[PDB]
């Protein structure tokens, strides 16, 4: 399920026993209730450009 279109996840993907899928995020991000989206929890999360984000 994860092998196909990142399993719907924005970031990380874990396959479970059966038709179960768990999306996860890199440290400095929290997962949203949609269970796919990652939102920053910090001022400078990795992979984001502050001059471009603050624009």
């Amino acid at each position: 399920i994860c092998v196909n279109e990142n399993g719907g996840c924005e970031q990380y993907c874990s396959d479970h026993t059966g038709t179960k899928r768990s999306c996860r995020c890199h440290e400095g991000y929290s997962l949203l209730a949609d269970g796919v989206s990652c939102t920053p929890t910090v001022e400078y999360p990795c992979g984001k450009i502050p001059i471009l984000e603050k624009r």
């Binding site: 924005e10 400078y44 990795c46 450009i49």
Partner: protein, 254 residues
């Protein structure tokens, strides 16, 4: 970087400039406040391990604007499988003496999970390569940080699409091809250790490291980058490890 453009100040915030005795040495990628990912071949000629400096927030080499942060390289960790004078397993993980302070100009690049890197990031065509290396073959290095977008190529296509030059190293499972064969666009020896960064759903990740190639933007030859996905577990275990006395440390691989 040959055929690229100037990376606007603050737009490559993870880029590291590695200095040895105040002189330009290599690039690197900040992955958190205390760790930098570079290439092992950068340290092949180092005698003065105490004179290694990493510069974050750098853009223009001729001017200090106050956004630069220098840190002594406390440790250089190289895989046991890396043989000096060769191309395979060309990765190094550096521990900075004290953390960097995250600012608009100093931001880490995301080190991805093996799973996501292999099954998702490996299929994003275009990724950005950067450094203050040569702007041309046998030409001058950049004063301002340059960036170039390069297409990733499958190894079989990379072998088929390249001019069969003898004595050339083999492209391994710990490396990949990216760039162009027309001699117009590449990264070169001065960009070594620098990032090959990949965009996926509004976040950039580390997928490769400026490693090796033929000359500099040579016709019929692509650029070769370390396949970072093979080193995730290796980097993570070490990032969780206590510092050892000495600058150069050789760690088992895998």
């Amino acid at each position: 970087i040959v055929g690229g453009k100037v990376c606007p100040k603050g737009e490559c915030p993870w880029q590291v400039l590695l200095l040895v005795n105040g002189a330009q040495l290599c690039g690197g990628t900040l992955i958190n406040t205390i760790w930098v990912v570079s290439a092992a071949h950068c340290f092949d000629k180092i005698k003065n391990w105490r004179n290694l400096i990493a510069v974050l927030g750098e853009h223009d080499l001729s001017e200090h604007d106050g956004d630069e942060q220098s840190r002594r390289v406390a440790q250089v960790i190289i895989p046991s499988t890396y043989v000096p004078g060769t191309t395979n397993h060309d990765i190094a993980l550096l521990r900075l003496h004290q953390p960097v302070v995250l600012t608009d100009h100093v931001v880490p690049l995301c080190l991805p999970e093996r799973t996501f890197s292999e099954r998702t990031l490996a299929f994003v065509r275009f990724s950005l390569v950067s450094g203050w290396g040569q702007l041309l073959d046998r030409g001058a290095t950049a004063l301002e940080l340059m960036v170039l977008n390069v297409p990733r190529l499958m190894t079989q296509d990379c072998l088929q699409q390249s001019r069969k030059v003898g004595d050339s190293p083999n492209i391994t499972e710990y490396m990949f091809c990216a760039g162009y064969s027309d001699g117009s666009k590449d990264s070169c020896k001065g960009d070594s250790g620098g990032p090959h960064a990949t965009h996926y759903r509004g976040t950039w990740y580390l997928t490769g490291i400026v490693s090796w190639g033929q000359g500099c933007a040579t016709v019929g030859h692509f650029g070769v980058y370390t396949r970072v996905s093979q080193y995730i577990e290796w980097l993570q275990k070490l990032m969780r490890s206590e510092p050892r006395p000495g600058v150069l440390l050789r760690a088992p691989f895998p």
